[PDB]
Amino acid sequence: DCNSALDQLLVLEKKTRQASDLASSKEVLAKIVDLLASRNKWDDLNEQLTLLSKKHIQYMIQKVMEYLKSSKSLDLNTRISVIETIRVVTENKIFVEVERARVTKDLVEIKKE
């Protein structure tokens, strides 16, 4: 059911008003990430994120992109996905603060070595 039950939860992500939208951001952005973890559904999640990232809450996204190797089933999948995460986060130049750089260590050296 949860695979179908995810949609009506992701809908209200369409906008941000009160702190109930950042609590909805917490819970929904954790479950979406969570759905990815159980059956390697995160591929959608990288893609899901790009769609969601196309919708643009930077530090709201910092934690959700943190999950890369926190709980990653396959190393190969991570390479190109992370390549897409840095790939998308290049532009504004505000990032690389901590988290992007520390996933560039991991991504660059671990991905290929």
Helical H runs in the chain? 2-5, 7-11, 19-39, 42-54, 58-70, 75-89, 99-105, 111
Q: How far apart are CA 113 and CA 88, in angstroms?
A: 23
Experimental method: cryo-EM
**Entry resolution (Å):** 3.5
Classify each residue of 77-91 as buried b or exposed e, where b means 16 or more C-beta atoms within 10 Å of its C-beta.
ebeebbeebbeebee
Q: For residue 30, count other CB atoms closer than 10 A to its CB.
A: 13
Consecutive H or E run containing 14: none
Residue 66 main-chain phi, psi, to 5 deg: -60, -25
Q: How many CA atoms lie within 13 A of 38 on its CB side?
A: 8
